[PDB]
Amino acid sequence: ELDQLRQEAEQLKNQIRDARKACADATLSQITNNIDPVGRIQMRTRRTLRGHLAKIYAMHWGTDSRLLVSASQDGKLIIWDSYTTNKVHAIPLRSSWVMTCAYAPSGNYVACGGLDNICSIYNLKTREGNVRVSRELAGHTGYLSCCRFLDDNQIVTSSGDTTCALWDIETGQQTTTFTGHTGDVMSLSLAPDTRLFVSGACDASAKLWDVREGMCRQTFTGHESDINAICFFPNGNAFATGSDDATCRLFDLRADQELMTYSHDNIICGITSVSFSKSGRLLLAGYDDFNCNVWDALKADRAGVLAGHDNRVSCLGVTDDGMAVATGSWDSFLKIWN
Amino acid sequence: TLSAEDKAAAERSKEIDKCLSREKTYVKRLVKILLLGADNSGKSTFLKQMRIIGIHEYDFEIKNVPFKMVDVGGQRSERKRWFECFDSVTSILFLVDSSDFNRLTESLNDFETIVNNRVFSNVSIILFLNKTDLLEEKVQIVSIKDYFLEFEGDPHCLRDVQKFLVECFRNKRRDQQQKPLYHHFTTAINTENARLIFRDVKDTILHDNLKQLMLQ
């Protein structure tokens, strides 16, 4: 029974590969030569946020596009007024091994998580005036790797226990477990409509999940190593992933197959963070070579080098209005480029 | 030209920076040890005795020097980012049950994986051959030859077995131009493990200073 079970498993594998290939008449590479190239894009350090004592691992831009939250090994969450490089809050984390940080779309909450396997929600707007812990969501048997807010009450967390989950902050209990990945989940990127989310989980695979139901609609193959970063296209039906094989790859949900490969022979180090531009023409990506490379999402050519970091660019985010890009690295500094 | 409220916000940021600078001295002076051990390595007893005088943390003071021993026994992962959280760790305290001869090979494999991870290149390894009296009473009875044919001395002499174990552990270390590897044949009731750990951490900091001095 198990032999024939794997038999139709492989049969469905060939069926889906054949469907994708038959739907693949031409590549985005061939259809893009006609349109004007992005040219040369040059960015400079507008502001250099300093004050962190250790390596940054995650940064998230607020919806107002002026406040950003940063996490580092000193166990401190620092919120920056990027316009005036002023620290707003300094939240002393319970666990110093923080590996992800989030900003609520409303702006009233920030969530941090790490090796403690707990995603902790921090309330920023309280009568006492000091940021307090609102909820310690527990239930994951793996290290927290990425957490993103949907509303002020629902948050999706991905961990190393091969299972992403949607929580309920008011109850504090898990609601739906997005199981199906066979490896440690590394990153998540909620869709702009907040009804779907993708995640790469070290199996070179990214699964698109339906938040309302809880089943992964479609699994994306490709890649050769652990997908360390995943971002969602602004339009809502495409996503780009970064891995440890130094290749950024763009998938589409409707075509459920690879579209382009943003790989260059010069770089050999993996990608730690990926985020698109406001219209998605640019595919900014932070690598371990101590700098970020800007890619044209339609032609896959190096549009520019976002150099200026003394260590590996661990995190990289783009504002909602797209008027700035924030890169965090292991040199305990954040630089905002424009 | 800044407004009154913008000036006050800058003042609040200055106070936050002052607090961060106050914590900076402790952060930079603190040494962290990642304690990696097996289930039978007697990690729990050594940990309990050392403090007296998810993942866990044990902060303690040795010779007015900040210390933090990180135990990841419950949650251990082979992924790159999980190991990358401990690249800034000063030294790795590896605990091995020498007395448990039958389990030496798996401990050797784990030691090889830890020391050849390429994320622990800049950290030192403080090996701790623990259960030394158990080791001696087993050595006077049983021979390391049955489980390890490469041993060359008399399997009933303690020094021969200890040297063979140290040699076999050191051979697993692929690169010898990196941070030093330290070995100690101390039991859990030595009550001097803090002194040895401090000595080896000071030696590692000495090595870092020598690297910074362009003396090589």
């Epitope: 002026r66 406040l67 007024d81 005036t84 002023n86 707003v88 809050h89 702006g107 009568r127 006492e128 005036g129 000091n130 | 030209t1 407004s3 009154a4 409220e5 913008d6 000036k7 006050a8 916000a9 003042e11 609040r12 200055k14 106070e15």
Partner: single-chain antibody, 235 residues
């Protein structure tokens, strides 16, 4: 909850000295800056002093510069005001005001019920409102207006105008901060807008908690001059 209780009230003779102590309980006193606003027996609010978080910057009003000293004790969670050589112009009830300052904060958030001190016997931004005892029916829509001598719109893009509600016999509470933002806990019926100088506050509905005296504060200049009293009254 958040409480701000002060102490010290007596009929001191002119030229004497006294100390106003304000005790804080229920919030991080160190992070919050503290002000001191006083009101003559029947007059409007007037700013006196200010101490920042950590006792960094200490400002004073020109009428009380030198005579008055404000010191805060963070571990004691207490705010102190050393006043000497009081005149008859100091006959007032002194309000303690907390104000935390960061991006998006709500300065002048909570006020404390003051203690009355009854003394025996320019560059300041002039904010004036030309209203007094507006006849108002319950449920109607009204628009309280305030004016500023110098425009309060800074290059940062936010006007530093504040609206305060002082209910009869009750300490003032913050309604609008920065001309537009609703304060926490206040109904959406309150709404405010304005321009570089012209300011206005409109209230959609008129229930029992709205009858009182309204105030407008400038926060561009540290003298922190107030306006007159509108004195909303039921028709």
């Amino acid at each position: 909850d958040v409480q701000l209780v002060e102490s010290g009230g007596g009929l001191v003779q002119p030229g004497g000295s006294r100390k106003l102590s304000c005790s804080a309980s229920g919030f991080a006193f160190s992070s919050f800056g503290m002000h001191w606003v006083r009101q003559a027996p029947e007059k409007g609010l007037e700013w006196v002093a200010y101490i920042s978080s950590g006792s960094g910057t200490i400002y004073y009003a020109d009428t009380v510069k030198g005579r008055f000293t404000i010191s805060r004790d963070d571990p004691k969670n207490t705010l102190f005001l050393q006043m000497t050589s009081l005149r008859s112009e100091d006959t007032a009830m002194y309000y303690c005001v907390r104000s935390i300052y960061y991006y998006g904060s709500s300065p002048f958030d909570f006020w404390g019920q003051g203690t009355t001190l009854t003394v025996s016997s320019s560059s300041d931004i002039v904010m004036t409102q030309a209203t007094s005892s507006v006849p108002v029916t319950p449920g109607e829509s009204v628009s309280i207006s305030c004016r500023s001598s110098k425009s309060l719109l800074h290059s940062n893009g936010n006007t530093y105008l504040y609206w305060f509600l002082q209910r009869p016999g009750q300490s003032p509470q913050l309604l609008i901060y920065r001309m537009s933002n609703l304060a926490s806990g206040v109904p959406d019926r309150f709404s405010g807008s304005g321009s570089g100088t012209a300011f206005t506050l409109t209230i959609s509905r008129l229930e029992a908690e709205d009858v009182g005296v309204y105030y407008c504060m400038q926060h561009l200049e540290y003298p922190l001059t107030f306006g007159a009293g509108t004195k909303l009254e039921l028709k």
